[PDB]
Amino acid sequence: TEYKLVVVGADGVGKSALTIQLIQNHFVDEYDPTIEDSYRKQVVIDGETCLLDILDTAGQEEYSAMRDQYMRTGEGFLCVFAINNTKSFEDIHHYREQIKRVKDSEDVPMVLVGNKCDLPSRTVDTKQAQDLARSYGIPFIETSAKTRQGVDDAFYTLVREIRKHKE
Ligand SMILES: Nc1nc2c(ncn2[C@@H]2O[C@H](COP(=O)(O)OP(=O)(O)O)[C@@H](O)[C@H]2O)c(=O)[nH]1
Numbered sequence: 001t002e003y004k005l006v007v008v009g010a011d012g013v014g015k016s017a018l019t020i021q022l023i024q025n026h027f028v029d030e031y032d033p034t035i036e037d038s039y040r041k042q043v044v045i046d047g048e049t050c051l052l053d054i055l056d057t058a059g060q061e062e063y064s065a066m067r068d069q070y071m072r073t074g075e076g077f078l079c080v081f082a083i084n085n086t087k088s089f090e091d092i093h094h095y096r097e098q099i100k101r102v103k104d105s106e107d108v109p110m111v112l113v114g115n116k117c118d119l120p121s122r123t124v125d126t127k128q129a130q131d132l133a134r135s136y137g138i139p140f141i142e143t144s145a146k147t148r149q150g151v152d153d154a155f156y157t158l159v160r161e162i163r164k165h166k167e
C-alpha cells in the first residue's frame with residue numbers, strides 16, 4: 001500500500017539533506033498494537049504512507065551489491081543534481097537510463113530536481129534542466145534543502161506521478 005520513493009544522484013548533491021528536510025515536516029506517530037511499545041514512526045506525503053530510500057554511489061556504497069535492487073524496488077525516483085555542479089547534471093541521463101533498463105519500462109515515475117538553488121554560483125541554467133525534463137516527459141523543480149524552497153513540492157509531485165502511474 002505504501003509508495004516507495006528512491007532519491008538518486010551524484011555524491012554531494014543533497015540527497016540526504018533533502019530527505020531529512022522532508023522527514024522533519026512529514027513524520028507522524030502511528031498506533032499499531034501488534035509492535036513493541038505500540039507506536040511506529042511513518043512518513044505521510046499527500047495522504048500516502050511513503051517509504052524512503054537514498055541510492056548512494058560513494059564511500060562504503062562504492063562497493064555495494066545493491067544498486068539494481070534499489071532501482072527494482074523503487075516505484076518513483078527523485079533524480080537530483082546541484083545547480084552549481086555541471087558534472088552532477090551531466091550524470092542524470094545515466095541514472096535515468098539505468099533505472100529504465102533495470103525496471104524494463106519506458107514509463108517510470110520520476111521528478112528532476114535541481115538542488116542548492118540558494119547558492120549564487122550557478123552553472124546549470126533552469127532552461128537546460130527544463131529542456132531535459134521535457135524530453136523525458138517528467139516534472140522539473142529547483143529546490144534548496146538549506147532554505148526549504150521547493151522541497152515539499154518535489155516530493156509531493158513525485159507522489160502524484162506515482163499515483164497516476166498506479167492509475
Ligand atoms: N547551500 C546548500 N547546501 C546544501 C544543499 N543541500 C545540501 N547541501 C550541502 O551539501 C553537502 C552534501 O549534502 P548531502 O546531503 O550530504 O548530499 P548527498 O551525498 O547527495 O546525500 C552538505 O554539506 C550539505 O549541507 C542546499 O540546498 N543548499
Ligand SMILES: [Mg+2]
Nearest residue numbers: 063064065066
Ligand atoms: Mg554485498
